[PDB]
Amino acid sequence: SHGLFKKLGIPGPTPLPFLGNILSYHKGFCMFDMECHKKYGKVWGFYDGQQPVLAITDPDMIKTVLVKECYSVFTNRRPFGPVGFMKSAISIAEDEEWKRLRSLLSPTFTSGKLKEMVPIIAQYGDVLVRNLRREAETGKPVTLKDVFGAYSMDVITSTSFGVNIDSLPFDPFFLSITVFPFLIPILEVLNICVFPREVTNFLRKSVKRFLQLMIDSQALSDLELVAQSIIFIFAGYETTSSVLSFIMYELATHPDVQQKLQEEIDAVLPNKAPPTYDTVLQMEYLDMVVNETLRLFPIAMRLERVCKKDVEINGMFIPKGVVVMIPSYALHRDPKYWTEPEKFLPERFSKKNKDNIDPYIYTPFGSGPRNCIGMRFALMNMKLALIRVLQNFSFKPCKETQIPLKLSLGGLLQPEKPVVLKVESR
Amino acid sequence: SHGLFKKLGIPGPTPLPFLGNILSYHKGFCMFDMECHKKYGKVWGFYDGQQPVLAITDPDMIKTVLVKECYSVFTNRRPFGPVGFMKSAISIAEDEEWKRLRSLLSPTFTSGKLKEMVPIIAQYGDVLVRNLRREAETGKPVTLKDVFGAYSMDVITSTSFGVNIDSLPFDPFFLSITVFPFLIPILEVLNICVFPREVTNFLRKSVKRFLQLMIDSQALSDLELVAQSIIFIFAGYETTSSVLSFIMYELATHPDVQQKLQEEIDAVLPNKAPPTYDTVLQMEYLDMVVNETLRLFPIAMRLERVCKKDVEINGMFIPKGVVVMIPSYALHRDPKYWTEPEKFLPERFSKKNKDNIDPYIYTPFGSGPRNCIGMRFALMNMKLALIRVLQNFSFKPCKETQIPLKLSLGGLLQPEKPVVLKVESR
Numbered sequence: 001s002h003g004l005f006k007k008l009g010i011p012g013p014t015p016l017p018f019l020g021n022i023l024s025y026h027k028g029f030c031m032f033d034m035e036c037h038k039k040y041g042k043v044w045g046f047y048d049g050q051q052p053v054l055a056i057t058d059p060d061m062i063k064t065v066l067v068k069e070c071y072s073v074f075t076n077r078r079p080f081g082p083v084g085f086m087k088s089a090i091s092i093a094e095d096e097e098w099k100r101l102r103s104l105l106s107p108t109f110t111s112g113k114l115k116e117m118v119p120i121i122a123q124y125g126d127v128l129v130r131n132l133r134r135e136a137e138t139g140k141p142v143t144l145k146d147v148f149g150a151y152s153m154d155v156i157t158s159t160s161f162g163v164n165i166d167s168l169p170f171d172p173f174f175l176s177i178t179v180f181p182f183l184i185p186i187l188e189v190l191n192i193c194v195f196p197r198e199v200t201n202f203l204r205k206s207v208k209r210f211l212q213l214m215i216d217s218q219a220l221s222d223l224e225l226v227a228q229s230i231i232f233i234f235a236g237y238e239t240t241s242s243v244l245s246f247i248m249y250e251l252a253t254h255p256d257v258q259q260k261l262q263e264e265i266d267a268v269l270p271n272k273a274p275p276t277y278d279t280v281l282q283m284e285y286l287d288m289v290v291n292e293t294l295r296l297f298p299i300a301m302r303l304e305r306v307c308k309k310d311v312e313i314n315g316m317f318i319p320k321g322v323v324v325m326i327p328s329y330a331l332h333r334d335p336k337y338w339t340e341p342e343k344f345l346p347e348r349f350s351k352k353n354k355d356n357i358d359p360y361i362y363t364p365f366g367s368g369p370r371n372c373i374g375m376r377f378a379l380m381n382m383k384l385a386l387i388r389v390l391q392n393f394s395f396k397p398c399k400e401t402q403i404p405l406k407l408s409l410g411g412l413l414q415p416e417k418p419v420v421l422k423v424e425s426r
Numbered sequence: 427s428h429g430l431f432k433k434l435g436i437p438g439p440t441p442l443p444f445l446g447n448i449l450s451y452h453k454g455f456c457m458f459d460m461e462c463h464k465k466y467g468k469v470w471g472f473y474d475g476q477q478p479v480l481a482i483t484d485p486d487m488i489k490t491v492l493v494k495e496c497y498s499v500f501t502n503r504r505p506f507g508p509v510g511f512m513k514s515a516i517s518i519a520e521d522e523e524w525k526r527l528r529s530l531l532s533p534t535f536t537s538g539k540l541k542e543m544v545p546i547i548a549q550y551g552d553v554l555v556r557n558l559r560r561e562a563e564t565g566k567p568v569t570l571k572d573v574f575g576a577y578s579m580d581v582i583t584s585t586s587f588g589v590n591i592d593s594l595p596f597d598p599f600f601l602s603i604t605v606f607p608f609l610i611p612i613l614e615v616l617n618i619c620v621f622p623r624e625v626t627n628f629l630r631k632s633v634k635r636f637l638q639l640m641i642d643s644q645a646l647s648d649l650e651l652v653a654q655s656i657i658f659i660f661a662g663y664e665t666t667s668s669v670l671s672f673i674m675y676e677l678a679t680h681p682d683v684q685q686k687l688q689e690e691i692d693a694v695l696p697n698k699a700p701p702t703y704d705t706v707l708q709m710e711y712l713d714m715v716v717n718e719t720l721r722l723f724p725i726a727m728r729l730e731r732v733c734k735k736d737v738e739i740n741g742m743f744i745p746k747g748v749v750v751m752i753p754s755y756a757l758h759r760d761p762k763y764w765t766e767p768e769k770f771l772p773e774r775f776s777k778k779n780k781d782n783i784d785p786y787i788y789t790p791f792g793s794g795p796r797n798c799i800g801m802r803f804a805l806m807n808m809k810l811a812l813i814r815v816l817q818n819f820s821f822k823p824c825k826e827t828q829i830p831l832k833l834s835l836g837g838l839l840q841p842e843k844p845v846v847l848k849v850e851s852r
């Protein structure tokens with residue numbers, strides 16, 4: 001099984017027995033792909049344990065896989081286990097089960113359903129400013145992800161089910177998953193779960209204890225309703241808090257961008273006006289700061305699809321079973337598309353330059369029928385948070401602020417040291 | 427996973443944890459299904475370990491599964507492992523891989539390719555008579571499957587590759603397969619094989635050391651060419667020898683049928699004429715003896731298909747993943763279709779009665795696009811053997827002959843004691 005890429009004439013690092021190329025993950029996925037992209041070029045291959053993975057970087061080939069041939073050949077991502085009842089989760093479900101869920105949960109983030117959330121989300125931002133107003137009178141550094149995640153958790157529990165909460169689950173084992181994918185069926189029969197069975201049991205009843213748009217379209221079951229809640233509750237918590245952490249870091253280390261951002265926020269919203277739906281989509285420099293940070297830090301790093309039958313896309317044969325992977329972190333930093341790629345420059349996304357950008361190289365939300373379902377909510381949730389917070393505070397680095405910011409070497413685009421900055425009240 | 431049939435309102439025996447209903451296999455598949463068919467009726471369910479299996483006995487529902495909805499929903503049989511390179515075997519392959527092989531190997535048993543085999547098969551029958559002429563001058567009982575299998579092996583090696591050979595591989599572990607189907611992926615990474623690795627290695631080179639119709643249509647690979655050879659070499663050996671054993675047993679315990687058979691053999695072939703292709707299809711009492719024996723002893727017992735997506739066939743919902751099984755042994759002995767079913771009566775298949783028989787109850791060769799590919803060869807190979815042997819010898823029971831014949835309790839319709847009879851020369 002380790003000769004598939006030598007057979008196909010597809011270059012790539014030489015795998016070791018059993019381990020495949022997993023030892024190269026010692027610098028993390030990101031550094032690995034970046035090197036691989038430089039070592040072999042437009043297409044290479046490797047082996048996650050015994051699993052052959054093909055990395056494509058051709059925008060037409062990517063558009064073919066993510067969009068053109070999704071419903072037919074590349075419907076599902078890499079199998080993930082032990083999952084248990086979470087197999088029915090939309091990010092985990094496959095084939096006709098997924099198509100049903102993706103239709104049943106699509107009308108949750110329509111342009112109208114989000115517009116009803118702006119008056120509701122506008123409460124915890126004041127809880128966020130007032131929670132930030134207490135640790136700023138105190139002249140001390142601040143952990144952003146804590147106060148952001150506390151904010152983000154307030155939003156996710158209320159935008160889906162609605163609960164007024166003032167928020168003042170969760171290399172190690174998965175290392176054995178990839179060399180022992182034959183052990184995943186073992187763990188599924190032991191009720192073993194990558195999600196600890198006390199975190200889910202806390203919710204296998206708490207959900208019985210978006211929510212409205214599920215039973216109303218019930219068709220849909222009940223234990224699957226809990227599993228979708230878990231996906232959303234994580235997605236809205238971690239992703240929103242993590243990217244907001246990255247954004248406030250970049251604003252602090254690039255102060256000119258921060259002021260020019262505060263100037264537009266007070267122009268569209270004078271006298272510190274409440275951000276409404278229509279004023280959020282008007283702030284284009286806000287959008288430029290958001291996109292550029294997502295370029296440097298696509299939390300997902302990679303987009304993956306399982307080839308489910310033999311194909312010959314764009315002149316290249318791809319055999320059945322190969323996991324097709326798009327190195328998103330690698331593409332977002334390729335000098336063959338980005339001038340001075342490591343530098344933070346939101347002017348890449350101005351309406352003067354936003355057209356020299358291939359939407360199949362910059363894919364922080366995926367593409368095609370399987371892209372991020374809550375893309376429009378996450379942009380709206382973050383922008384309402386950046387408006388309300390940059391309307392009241394400025395952000396400076398501290399002595400303990402990590403500069404340059406080191407990325408983690410795990411499986412999530414997280415910083416090594418938590419992001420701490422000084423906050424000052426305008 | 428053990429409540430699927432209580433949910434669906436489908437009756438069946440109560441399963442034990444982990445074991446499912448496997449403990450009921452203590453009397454063998456046949457007795458189990460026969461009881462289940464009587465206990466619950468037209469449809470029941472059970473659990474092979476954790477695997478839900480639905481047993482259908484409705485001829486329209488069977489015709490729906492085997493024929494009408496084969497290419498769409500019921501393409502593949504129950505997964506079988508550890509197989510190794512034998513995963514590419516046609517009886518084991520799935521989905522588009524199977525469709526390719528079934529097309530590439532279909533023109534091996536055409537009406538013309540078989541007609542070229544009659545002059546070739548006509549040699550070892552004389553080796554069979556002369557091998558039987560030596561242990562008949564000796565007034566002693568005879569093991570039929572030995573001299574039949576020696577004959578059958580002579581035919582299979584020459585009808586496919588061609589080798590003049592005078593022939594004077596192979597409850598226990600699989601018991602753990604069904605309660606540990608999660609262990610099949612484990613064994614596939616250890617090169618562990620249900621076919622001992624020295625039997626295949628004897629052939630992983632011997633085939634490099636039907637055969638003509640494979641490279642000529644090479645498309646087709648080479649390690650897969652060996653795997654198809656293994657399937658055919660087993661199929662032609664064991665099945666042919668085993669059914670011939672059953673046929674000579676039934677002729678001995680029912681002597682009137684044997685004489686009436688010898689009378690037709692000498693009528694179509696006077697002076698002990700060599701059986702040709704066209705004279706074999708003329709002997710209708712020969713065909714009646716063959717069909718009736720296959721009714722009592724369908725070596726396969728069961729036909730199985732894996733439901734690969736939700737369906738509602740003939741008013742019954744069937745969920746994704748359920749193994750749909752047709753209890754062939756049970757149906758061939760159902761009094762609601764067969765008068766006095768345990769009695770050997772070839773007159774069921776005369777042209778006066780052959781029309782009161784549903785070809786979706788009597789299915790000794792399956793049905794639909796996945797039926798026995800070598801059905802026409804096996805009938806021809808056996809009939810050429812019965813003609814040449816009943817033209818020279820008669821068969822009487824011995825003191826050690828097992829009467830009534832006990833079936834084995836394993837996973838193949840084999841007799842407990844080998845079939846031994848006395849042979850006399852005409």
Ligand code: HEM
Nearest residue numbers: 090091232235236239300365366367370371372373374378
């Ligand atoms: C900055 C914020 C976010 C980013 C960058 C992001 C990014 C992504 C990416 C790259 C994918 C994979 C796309 C693909 O495979 O083609 C994805 C999938 C997904 N995202 Fe997000 N996401 C964010 C926030 C959210 C939020 C708030 C939710 C709320 C429910 C969410 C729900 C999902 C789901 C359910 C999927 C699976 C899609 C499917 O299987 O149909 N995401 N996301």
Ligand code: HEM
Nearest residue numbers: 516517658661662665726791792793796797798799800804
């Ligand atoms: C008395 C002799 C035989 C009987 C009763 C018999 C019976 C059967 C049955 C019941 C099936 C399954 C059909 C289904 O699942 O719907 C099958 C499959 C098969 N048989 Fe036979 N068989 C016999 C001899 C042979 C011979 C001589 C060959 C020679 C190659 C052969 C090759 C196969 C193959 C390859 C399959 C798998 C079909 C597929 O997956 O496409 N059989 N047989």
Ligand SMILES: O=C(NCCCc1cccnc1)[C@@H](Cc1ccccc1)SC[C@H](Cc1ccccc1)NC(=O)C(F)(F)F
Nearest residue numbers: 077078079080089091092230231232234235239299300372
């Ligand atoms: O649900 C999962 N993530 C997407 C859910 C929320 C989200 C996060 C980021 C952005 N948007 C949405 C993965 C595990 C998980 C975690 C928490 C709750 C419940 C479950 S399991 C399936 C994932 C496929 C996948 C990964 C990242 C993003 C999108 C989709 N596969 C792997 O992580 C693999 F190991 F193969 F690399």
Ligand SMILES: O=C(NCCCc1cccnc1)[C@@H](Cc1ccccc1)SC[C@H](Cc1ccccc1)NC(=O)C(F)(F)F
Nearest residue numbers: 503504505506515517518656657658660661665725726798
């Ligand atoms: O190849 C296999 N048999 C069919 C091949 C020849 C044949 C025999 C009888 C009549 N015709 C043709 C089975 C194992 C095997 C044995 C010998 C060589 C190589 C391989 S493996 C796949 C089988 C599906 C299956 C079973 C019986 C008949 C037809 C098809 N599945 C199981 O036996 C399961 F355990 F699920 F119950």
